[PDB]
Every structure is written in C-alpha cells, then in structure tokens.
Design a protein around this ligand. Sequence first.
Ligand code: GNP
Ligand code: CL
Ligand code: MG
Lengths: 15, 997, 130, 209
Amino acid sequence: RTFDMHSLESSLIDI
Amino acid sequence: GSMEGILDFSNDLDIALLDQVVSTFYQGSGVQQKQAQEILTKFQDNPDAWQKADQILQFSTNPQSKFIALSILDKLITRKWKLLPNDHRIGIRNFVVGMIISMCQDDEVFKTQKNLINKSDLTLVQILKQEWPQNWPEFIPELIGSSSSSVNVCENNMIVLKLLSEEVFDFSAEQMTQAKALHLKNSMSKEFEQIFKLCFQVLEQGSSSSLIVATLESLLRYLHWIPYRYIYETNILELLSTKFMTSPDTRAITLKCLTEVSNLKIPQDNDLIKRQTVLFFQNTLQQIATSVMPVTADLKATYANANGNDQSFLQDLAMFLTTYLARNRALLESDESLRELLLNAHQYLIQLSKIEERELFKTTLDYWHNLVADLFYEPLKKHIYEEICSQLRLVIIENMVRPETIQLYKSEREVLVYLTHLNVIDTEEIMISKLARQIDGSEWSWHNINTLSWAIGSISGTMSEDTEKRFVVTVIKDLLGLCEQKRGKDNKAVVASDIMYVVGQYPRFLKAHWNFLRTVILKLFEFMHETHEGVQDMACDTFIKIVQKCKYHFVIQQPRESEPFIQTIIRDIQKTTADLQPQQVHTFYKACGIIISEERSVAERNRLLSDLMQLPNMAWDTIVEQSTANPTLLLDSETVKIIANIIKTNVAVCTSMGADFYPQLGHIYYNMLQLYRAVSSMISAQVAAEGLIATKTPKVRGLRTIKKEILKLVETYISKARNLDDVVKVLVEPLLNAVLEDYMNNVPDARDAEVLNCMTTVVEKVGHMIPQGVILILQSVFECTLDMINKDFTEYPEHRVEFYKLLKVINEKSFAAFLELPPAAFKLFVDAICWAFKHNNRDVEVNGLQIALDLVKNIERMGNVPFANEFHKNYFFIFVSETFFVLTDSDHKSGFSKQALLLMKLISLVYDNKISVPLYQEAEVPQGTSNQVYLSQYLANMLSNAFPHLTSEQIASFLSALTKQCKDLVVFKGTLRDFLVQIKEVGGDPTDYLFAE
Amino acid sequence: IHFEPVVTMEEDEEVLYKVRAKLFRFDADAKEWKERGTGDCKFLKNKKTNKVRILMRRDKTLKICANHIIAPEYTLKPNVGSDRSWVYACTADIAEGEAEAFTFAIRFGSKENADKFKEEFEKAQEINKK
Amino acid sequence: QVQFKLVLVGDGGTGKTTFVKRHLTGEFEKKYVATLGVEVHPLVFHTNRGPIKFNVWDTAGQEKFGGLRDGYYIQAQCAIIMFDVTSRVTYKNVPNWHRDLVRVCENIPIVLCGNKVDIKDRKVKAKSIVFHRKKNLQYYDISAKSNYNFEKPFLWLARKLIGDPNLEFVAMPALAPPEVVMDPALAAQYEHDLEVAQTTALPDEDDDL
Ligand SMILES: Nc1nc2c(ncn2[C@@H]2O[C@H](COP(=O)(O)OP(=O)(O)NP(=O)(O)O)[C@@H](O)[C@H]2O)c(=O)[nH]1
Ligand SMILES: [Cl-]
Ligand SMILES: [Mg+2]
C-alpha cells in the first residue's frame, strides 16, 4: 500500500 | 645499565658493546629494545660521535652498526663539513671511497650487504655535493674508468650516479641554495656525455641482469632532465622498447623509462622525431602482446589474482599508455597503417579499466576524460573510437559510484556525459538493456539497481528536451514495473528509492509536466509516514532537492488548479510532518521557505511565511507565556527540547529565505532575546550550585543549545539582510545588550564561542554603521577571551579561531575601534597578533598574519600623524623580529608565503621612507642616521645573535639582497629560502645571495 | 553412468539482545575515560548453562572489547554528562586475555536504546541468578 | 610466529601515533605528545589464514625528535606513509619520506594514508593526491577519529605479505567468561573508584555514539 506506485503510473500514462 | 657504556667517550669505544646495543634494538623487544633505542640515539647525537665512525666501519661485524656510523657521518657532512680541518675532509673522503671499493671487490659482501652499500653510496654523494667538481674534477672520468674493471663496481657506480642525479635534480629545491643547485646541475650537464656513453655501452653489451637493471634505474632519473638528443639521436629507444621489454627483470623499469620519454621535450615539426615516437610505442605494444598477454586477456582477473608483480606491472602499463596517448595519439590517428596500433592500445586500456582497484580506475578515467573531451570538440575524430567508446559506456555505467567517492562520481558523470553527446542512441540502448536485465532477474541486486539508477541520473541535461522526455518515461515506467514485480518491503523500498532518485535528477521533465510533479510530491508525503529504515530521510531529501530545482512551479497557480501548490502543502503540513524526526521537519520547512521566497508579491510572501510558521509560532507563544510565569518550567528537559526545535525551525526557514525572513524574525525577536537572558541566568545558577561539571550535564547542554541556536538565527539573518538600517536600528542594540555582558561575566567554561561568531557577522555587515557598538564588542570580549587562549595553543580551540576572525573583521571594517583602545589594551592587541603567528593551527596562523598585514596598512594610511609615529616607534621592530622568528624556526613552514609578504611590507616601509620618525632612540646611533641604515644594523645584530654560526659577510650579503628585492616577492622569497638553507649548515657562501642579480 | 563431481565460540549461544554502542574504560590514574570499542553489543545466553554474557566486538576488526558475565551483583549507574549511558563496575572481563576488573561506561545512540539496554541487562541478571 | 616489521612515517602531527593507538587499545588520544625517535608496538590481527603479527615501528615526524631516522627502516617488510589532508605541507613532504624509505627498503608493500578526513575544511583535495600512482603505493583516505577506512591499510598489507588476495579479518574466538566472585574486602575500594567514574563526564557527548 505504502510502496504502491500505481499513482505514478497513471499520471505517466496520462501524458 | 651496562649498555650505556658506549656513551662514555673518555674511554675507548668497545665495538662489541656497540654491536650488542644495536642487536638488542633491532632484533630484541620490549623494555630492552626501548632502553637500547634511547642509548643509540644519545650516541648518534653526540657531536663527537663522527670521530669514532672509522673505528666502527673498520672493526664492527654488525652491518646495522656501520649503517648508523654512516648516518652519523651524514650529519657531519651535511651540516659541519666546512668547519672541519682540511685533513679530516680528505680523510673522510678517502675512507668512504676505500670502504665502497672493498665492499664491491668482495662478491659475498656485495651480494649480502646491499643496505650498507647503498647507504655508503648515498654518503659518498653527500661528499660530492660538497666537493665536486671544484675539488674533485677527476671523479666522473675515474668512475667511468673503474667501471670497466669490474661488473660489481660498474653496477655500484650506476647506483652512485642515480643517487647523484636525484640529489641534484629531483631533491635540490629545498636542500640547496639556488646558486649551489645551479652549480651542480651545470656540472652534471657538462659531463653527462661521458656518463651516457657508459650507460649506453652497458645496455647495448652487458648481460648481467643486476647490472642492466641498475643502469636502467639510473636512466630513469636522467630522463627527468637530459637533452632529448640523447634519447632520439641514439639507438636507445629501440633497446628500451624491444630488448628490455622481453625480460621481466628489466620490464618494470624499462616501462617506467618509456613513460618518462613520453614526457620529454618534443619539437612537433620534425617528422623524423615523430616516426621514432611512433616506433617505440609500436615496439612496446608488440612486446606486450607477444611476451606478456594478448589484448583479449582478462586483466581484471589477472590483477585480482595478484601473482608476483602483476599488479605493479598493470599499474605501470596504465601509466605508460595513458601518458603516451594523451600526448601522442594524434600521431596514430591519420595513418591507416597505424590504426590497429591505436585501437589495440585503447583496447588494453578498456581491459585495464575493468580492474577492481579504485586508484587505478581513477588513473584510467582521467585519460578517458581527456579522450572524449577531445572527440567532443575535434572534427572527424569520434568515428575512429566508436567501438572503444561503446565499450567505455558499459564500463562506466557498471562502475558508477554513489553520488551523495563524491569526486569519483563527478568524474564518472563528466565522462559519461561526453559519451552521451558522442552517441546518444548507444547510451540509451545500453541503459535500457541494463534495466531489462534487472527486470528478468539476470543481474538483479540492490547494489546493481542502485548503480544503474545513479548512471541514468548522471546524464540528465545531455539530451535535447524532447529526446530527454522520451527516455525518462521509458526508464520510470520500467522502474515502476520492476517495483510491482518485487515482494517484501525490503526490495520495494530499494526500487522506490531509485525511482525517486531518477525523477529528482530530471527537473526539466518535472517542470514540463505539472501533473506528474504533483503526483511525485504527494507520493513523497506518503513516504514521510513510512518508518522503514531510510525511507523518511529519502523522502525529505528528494522533496527539497526537487523544490530547489522546480520551486517556480509551486509558487504560481497552475492550470486547472484553484491555488498555488505551496498553499496546499502548508494547509496540511501538520499531518504531513507528523511522523518525522525534528531534523527532518526542519528540512521540510526549509524547502517551503525556498518556494515562498520566489513569491515576489511582498504581501503574499509574508502571508505564506506567517502560515508556514503557524505551528512553531503557536508553540512558541505558549512556552514564552509559561516559562516566564514559571522559570522553573524551563528546567524541564522536554520544554528545553521543544524550545530548541522551534528556534531550529526558524533557522531552517531563515536559511532559505534570508532577507525575506525579517517579518518572522520580528514576531519572535524581543521575546527570544528575553529567553536568551532567562536561559543564561539558569546556566549561571547551575554552574554556581553544581560547579563547572554542570556544563557537561544534559540539562545545561540543552540550555546552551537554546543560546547557540538563537545566536545562529540572528547570525543567519544578518548575514543575508538587505535592509541594514533595520539591522542597526532594530536588531543590534537589543542583541548586544543581551549577549555581551553575559559573555564577559560568565566563567570561561560557560562562554559560548558562538557569541564571537555572531559578532563577527554583525561587524562584517554593519560594522561601519555602529562604531560605538564595535567598541562595546571589544570591551566585552577582547581581554577576557585573550586570557583564555594565551596560556597555551590547545585550550578553547573554538574560541581561539572565532577570536581572530573577529579581530580580523574589526581591523578591516572598524579600525577606529583599535585607535580608541587605551595604550595598554592596544599593546595586548599587538601581543595577540604575534601570539597568532606562533600557532601551528592554520585556522589561527593565517588570520594572525593577515591581521598584521592589514594593521600595517591601516597605520600606513594614517600618514604622518602622532599615532602612526608612536606605532612604528613601539611596534615596528617587534613585528619584524617576530615575523623573522616564525620564518626561521622550522615549525611554521605552512605560513611561509604570508610571513614573507608581511616581512617584505615591513622592509619596504623603511626603504620607501614611509616612516617619518627615527626608529632608533636619540642616543643610540648618530643624529641624521637614516632608518634604512639603522634597519640593516638592527637586523644584522639580530641575526648575529640568533644565528651565531653565520659569518658577518653571510648576514650582510643576505640583508643586502633581501633589501634590494623588497618589491619583487618571488625573488624575495627565493632569498629567504636560500637563507633557510644556509642557517642549517656552516660556511655557506655569501655570494649565493647574488643569484637573482 | 556416474560422473565423479569436482572436489568464534558463539555457536552454542542464543542472542537475547543486540544494540549498537560505544564502550569506555575508566583510567583511574589519568582520571579520564578512554574508548575501548564501538560496535554491536550482544547479550548471549549459553544453551548448556543458561548463563548470559555481554559480548561486544569492534567494527571491521571484529576484535573483542567486552566479554564478561552479566553478574546479578552489578548495578548500572548514570554518568553525570550523559542521559544515554550507563556506568558499572566489572570484576572479571576477559576481552584482552586474563580476567581483569574494569569500571566500564557504555553509551548508546539514544536514551530509549540506553533504557532498553537497562531493561534487558536486568532481565539477563535474573536469568543468571537462577 | 608469523610477524612482519612495519614502519610508519610522515610529518609530525599527521596522526601516526593516534592511528596505532586506536588499533592497539581502541582509544582516541586527543592530545599531541610528540613521538621521540620511535615506539615499537606489537599488533595482531586474526584472519582466515591464521593470526598475523605486525611489529609497528611508529617513528617521529618532527626533525628535532627524529632519532635514528632512516636507521629505523632497516629490514622493514612493509610501511605506511601518513599525511594530513588538512595540511598541504604534510602532503608536499610525502615524496621526501618516500625517498628516504625506499632507499633503505627497495621492494616492500607501502600504503599512503591521508588522515583526518573527518575534518570539514579539507585542504589536500582528492584530485591533488596522485603521488602513489607512479610509485605503486596503495592509497586510502582514513580517519583515526571516525575510524573511516582505519582497517584498510593493515588488510591490504596483510594480503600482500601473506600473498593471498582473499585474506579477510575474522572474529577472534570468544572464550566463555568466568563466573564472578567479588571480594568484600575491596567493596569500599570499588565503590570509591565508581564514584569518581560517575562524576567524570564521558567525552564527545555530541557524537553519534
Ligand atoms: N580530527 C582528527 N584529529 C586527529 C586524527 N588523528 C590524529 N589526530 C590528532 O592529531 C594530533 C597529533 O596526533 P599524533 O598521533 O601525535 O601525530 P604523530 O604523527 O604521531 N606526531 P609525531 O610524528 O610528532 O609523533 C592529535 O591531537 C590527534 O588527536 C584524526 O583522524 N582526526
Ligand atoms: Cl648525442
Ligand atoms: Mg607520534
């Protein structure tokens, strides 16, 4: 949960 | 003890007893060894011990005893040679020569007592430096003659010549006067033609390996200074690069010789010379490939095995290749028949660069930097080295060290940045592929993913923006995938940390994509709650690192955002920082301060500042209200800790905001200084009740931390203040009232050196505006601090350093304060400066010498007025003599340049007639005597008494030269260095001081 | 077909407690504290005898700077200059050979580490009393 | 017994004696007491190849206390050359110490050590330090105060002297300590010594440990 980086993924795909 | 019998010179020396003491020292142990050691030293230091040297060298059967006898003789020859009667000088020469001859004629002795022979040879050289060639013209001719009569003598002669070359060309600079050094250099140069003929004959003909090696060892020394014609117009390069590379015995020294030839002075218009330079390289590389190892060999493995002298050889090969190629690779780059040679040489270097050896890697890396920098600029060169560079990319990436070894990282970054410019496609491919092998597990490890992440991070800013953009998306998505794959917090923490590291290295990407930047930051805030070891530090470090680079994007309102993100961070700061240790919270607040300072609307900036400081300001207000109601509450260790952390938070924000911090400083300033007073009383009360040991207790240390942080906060703001009127009118008077009398009236152990440091900044910034304030500073800290540090050089080290920094800036900014001092206190000031001269501590000595110089200048600027005249009358010769003392006492060598500068300034005052009054008393010398004449007289008398072994002519010649040269520092210093040489011996030549002109 | 293939004395102890620390020894003649070592301080319980000892080694060199029984008679006392240290008398430490008495001081990275050490130290003393 | 003579040389004040003391007893001596001539200290390390013994000849760096000088180097089998990274002059003198050393010891392993890297204001920058290259010396940044790399010089020399690159320091055996039997006769003595110890502050209270 703490090291779940999916937030980074979604923001990067959104590019 | 019985051993002490050798110390009685009235009786004849018992050689058997000497050998026992020596044996006890070298082969014995414990108390016995220690006693013998002290006896031998006393024996050696007996100024008449040299007279018994011949007895020992003749009748002793212990080679260590003879070694010590030669050491005793060395001392004599080096320092008192010209004091001896002429018969003793001749006698000592004949004895040493005869001793060397006999040792060389005995094959058993020659082979088993190398240490004694080498020592004897060195001793001979010490005599040569005194006697040759002016009183020994036949030495070299006879040396060459005797070389042919015996291989042992020939070999030993090469050792003598080696040492002679070393003492004359390599180590003469600080051991001889300029004139004597030049005399000996010219002397060797005059007769080298003969010497070279011998050396070349031995190399061309000789078969004795020990002889050839010694000859090559001597040649290595010659190559430091001899004309290039001896190397290029003879056949010797052929011999070095072929014959002597094949046998391992000569290989090591030959390689060292060829490295120096790669440094010989050459013309670069002679095509014949250029062919020879190519040729010996070709030969050498050919010998390595055929006799040592092929270019494909695993040198990393070889080096690691560490067989025989393999490591030294590979080290030497690296030095040879890098040295030669850095100077001459252009010779190999045009001719197509030389291309294989060029690339083979560089392929060896690639292999050497894989060796696991830090210092060797730095050597090769220095060369790689030289190469790729050239390829980056020089037309039509990079295509030649494409395969070399591709390999180098992998080597540097795989050996990338932690950035934080700092110097090594920067060097690696620099080379890899060049390599990225040279071929950006190859670099990307290598890194992506490297990353792919982390993901499939083939090369997965915490170390390996870290290394790769540092490498990827190091090349940011190299690619053009759009190119860079595509690369980082790939890497991060790949790293993001790698993170999912791994299980357990240990593994995911590592990858997550590397994700944040790479992102933090590419701010240009972050600035162009706000949504991603936002997401990264909010993720960092999550990490600030993670107690996993290292994660919180990593989060805070990355946060401020990103802010420092992208702060502008936090202060503006972004599209589809209701407000600047800095507001959003501040709104929830309590929650975000709730799990952070104090030091981490300060970093967080400091980062916020960086952002706030970019807000150029003053009203908005102050609003942000007040909101940022809300938590500490509220905590502050409460404890100021409580601790003032009950000063005993201030004894609570918890409250003391809370108070310190509040001030530390202010320090953190003030550090990033500087001048802009003033409104927050205003909020706390008056109550803060009152707290300083309250804490000060408590400290004093505790020391009174418990004694000095109180200063060691956690309670008092906690209290003094409050005082130090308060001082730090004020110092930090004032050093960055732009409005100096406010500093003077608002801050300074309350500050001085709060800290000065407290400092003065505390016992020494309770005084904070930080007070001095704070005052230094105050004087630095606004000293010119507060003349009475500076006087008050001096009155309160000068005499009581001086008395703390003028009993020895070790006590109160921080006070000591800050003390002279403060005096230096006062002397610079408010010299008038020293003019107001009463005569007695000004005398203490002069004493204090000279006291600083005598420190070996650089942090004191340098400032002391600078204060003296600035002071003399300050006095000079005053012109012909009573104070300046009295200053010179009282203190001119004190500064001259004190400066001379530290110059000549051999315990302050580090301050030589500044000592010389000060002395030159002082002497130039007199010889420019910038001192109006007579420096002498009316009765001392006749009326009308110039200060110039009296200075020479004073100095001559001073040096005569301080250095009684110098002749009057030496002193006179030295002072005449020194005086003439008081406008040319370089020459002046040369004359001083010559003097320092001459005082170490008897009978120095006064004409040496005419060396300049 | 068979192919022939190619050709500390802490083992009997349980680690009850481990903590980073710096150990000092009091030089009564010089009247000053001298560092003896920095590294991991371990409480080791022997499996056979159930008795607990302190064993502390220096970083890198792994040389012993403390080796003695946590005797139930020992008492941890505060040092005047520290809130993260304990002072106590040891009458039989064999870190450097023959058993010898020392006045030790041991310092820790934090007060809570020092206080936990205190707790473990006393627990270990209870083990040794039985 | 496998023992090797090690000579330690370098300018006065560079930390030679402090370095050796740290290895001998674990203590850090703050005071500078100049070595007079030489002091010989046995120093043993336990390795996977058995114990190795260094007889360390800690020589005087001050000229006026030089004693036998190069006489100390005789039959040395290895050496450490020390300088101070906060003092440029000590590095400038490294070639002089090296010269005097290899004239007596023509083929021994030698470590060059830049001491006091713990001090903030470093004066001899890492990139300035290159003397060891052509002379085949091993170099290490060290600090006797913070123990940074303090083991490296001996580990490297041990590997060279034994001729085993895979030599490692290992943990010396830890004998079972004896059960305590305190003397009631010395109870007042120990309590007296304990009082003095408690009231004498530990040094360097600001350190991490
Ligand atoms: N900050 C710091 N100080 C050190 C370090 N090593 C030694 N010192 C200090 O340097 C000073 C001199 O130490 P010392 O060992 O006597 O040097 P030395 O080389 O033996 N001098 P000499 O040749 O005259 O005998 C001491 O005060 C010592 O505490 C260090 O690594 N860091
Ligand atoms: Cl010629
Ligand atoms: Mg010493």
